[PDB]
Swiss-Prot record, chain B:
Record's subcellular location: Virion
Gene for this chain: D17
Subunit structure: Homotrimer. Interacts with baseplate hub protein pb3. Interacts with receptor-binding protein pb5.
Organism: Escherichia phage T5 (Enterobacteria phage T5)
Superkingdom field: Viruses
Organism placement in taxonomy: Viruses, Duplodnaviria, Heunggongvirae, Uroviricota, Caudoviricetes
Entry protein name: Straight fiber protein pb4
UniProtKB/Swiss-Prot annotation, chain C:
Localization (cell): Virion
Subunit structure: Homotrimer. Interacts with baseplate hub protein pb3. Interacts with receptor-binding protein pb5.
Function: Together with BHP-pb3, forms the central straight fiber, bearing the receptor binding protein RBP-pb5 at its C-terminus. Upon RBP-pb5 binding to the host receptor FhuA, the central fiber reorganizes and undergoes structural rearrangements that lead to its bending, bringing BHP-pb3 close to the host membrane for anchoring.
Higher taxonomy: Viruses, Duplodnaviria, Heunggongvirae, Uroviricota, Caudoviricetes
Protein name (record): Straight fiber protein pb4
Full protein segment contained here: 277 to 413 of 688
Annotated source species: Escherichia phage T5
């Protein structure tokens, strides 16, 4: 039973030519969102066909979207679809279609134009957000080093995602989701002061009724731990003692049989 | 035996149990904060009756040490 | 990418070009080179302006977006949001999906493929089931 992600609750509009669309997203006990897509088509084209050959704009799970040079006095329709990591059948949920047309009666809100900021410099490429009287760095791209910090800076200055070709390292704080990973050394690390490095199936804990695998270092008791199997049939190991619930077989029949000659019995 | 701990840096802190298990020549445990601690150790032995358990007067190491960070 | 661009190539000057092929593997055969082919820019060389139309780079205070013309329409391939630095890469297939993206707000980097690294230092090698039909291992 996979619960698809919940579509954005509401849509608002801001205009300047340029048109901005931002959608609020709230979710509970549902699939987490990983990407947001907006599709915009002309209303007449929508009547002719349903969202087919409709230009789409994709964002990295950012609520606000910007359309530059929107058609003037032309009807349009939009939908915002949340994207999750589930199966294709319920991977994506789309919001309710909302029509919209640029009109002389629509108030012009140019505040969003000033509230952001980007700059192209020989030294780097940098994006900023206007916060009161100051500007906060969003992402940086240095010229001397191919370092790309992504995300609003922490109060202590810790960037969420960091890169370093100099050390040939890709540094990401948080989580990484990939279909597969190929490597030569899965060296688990106790990155935090009190972390517990381990490899396991999601939502599995040692000495638990779940049916997963758990392997890692238990910093609480400072001993390695292991568990493979369900609640009843399992291979559970603690540094002090090992327990194997399931039936165990050692060797194979005729393991030490003479190859040149067989065996037999007679009376 | 059960082993308790208390951060001695502050004037008064509540003793906290961190290890429960069989008494051994050497005891290993982790998952403790960074502050300097005082350690008391007590042993509990079960009377033939399941309910009643005989404990010990808490013995405390005179030395006080910081957790190896 | 299967193509490359050289901006402001010198005119009336000969040049020689080789195309490498780098792949994961032993250092001895880590790379493979294309056949050497020289070129010259001259009036005898026909000019093809077709390639200018397809590519497109959009730079704005709001964001930086790269776009490609397909069927006489811009198609977004990667966007760099100026606000919050939301980044997604790769062409959109069927419903808009970017194979690679980074979310600083949720501190999650999403990849729809494989990641290759000599070493990985992670404190939780959680073995999830994403598609739901593939048993993870």
């Amino acid at each position: 039973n996979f619960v698809p992600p919940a579509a954005p609750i509401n849509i608002v509009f801001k205009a300047a030519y340029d048109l901005r669309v931002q959608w609020d997203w709230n979710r509970g006990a549902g699939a987490n969102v990983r990407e947001f897509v907006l599709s915009y088509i002309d209303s007449a084209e929508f009547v002719r066909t349903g969202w087919t050959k409709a230009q789409k704009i994709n964002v990295g799970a950012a609520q606000s979207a910007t359309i530059i040079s929107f058609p003037w006095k032309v009807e349009h329709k939009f939908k915002v679809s949340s994207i999750a990591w589930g199966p294709d059948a319920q991977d994506v949920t789309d919001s309710a279609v909302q029509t919209f047309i640029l009109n002389e009666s629509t108030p012009l809100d140019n505040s969003f134009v000033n509230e952001t900021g980007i700059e192209v410099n020989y030294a780097y490429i940098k994006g900023k957000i206007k916060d009161g009287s100051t500007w906060k760095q969003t992402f940086l791209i240095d010229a001397a080093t191919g370092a790309i910090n992504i995300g609003l800076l922490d109060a202590e200055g810790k960037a969420p995602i960091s890169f370093d070709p100099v050390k040939k390292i890709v540094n990401v704080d948080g989580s990484v989701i990939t279909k597969t990973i190929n490597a030569a050394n899965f060296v688990m690390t106790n990155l935090t002061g009190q972390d517990n490095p381990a490899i396991y199936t999601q939502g599995k804990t040692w000495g638990d009724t779940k049916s997963g695998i758990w392997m890692g270092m238990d910093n609480v008791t400072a001993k390695p731990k292991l568990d493979i199997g369900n609640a009843t049939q399992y291979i559970r190991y603690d540094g002090n003692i090992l327990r194997i619930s399931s039936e165990v077989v050692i060797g194979t029949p005729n393991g030490d049989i003479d190859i040149q000659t067989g065996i037999q019995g007679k009376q | 035996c059960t082993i308790e701990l208390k951060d001695n840096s502050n004037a008064n802190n509540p003793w906290v149990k961190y290890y429960v298990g069989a008494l051994m020549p050497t005891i290993m445990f982790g998952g403790v904060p960074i502050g300097s601690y005082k350690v008391r150790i007590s042993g509990q032995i079960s009377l033939p009756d399941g309910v009643t358990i005989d404990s010990s007067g808490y013995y405390e190491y005179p030395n006080v040490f910081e957790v190896r960070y």
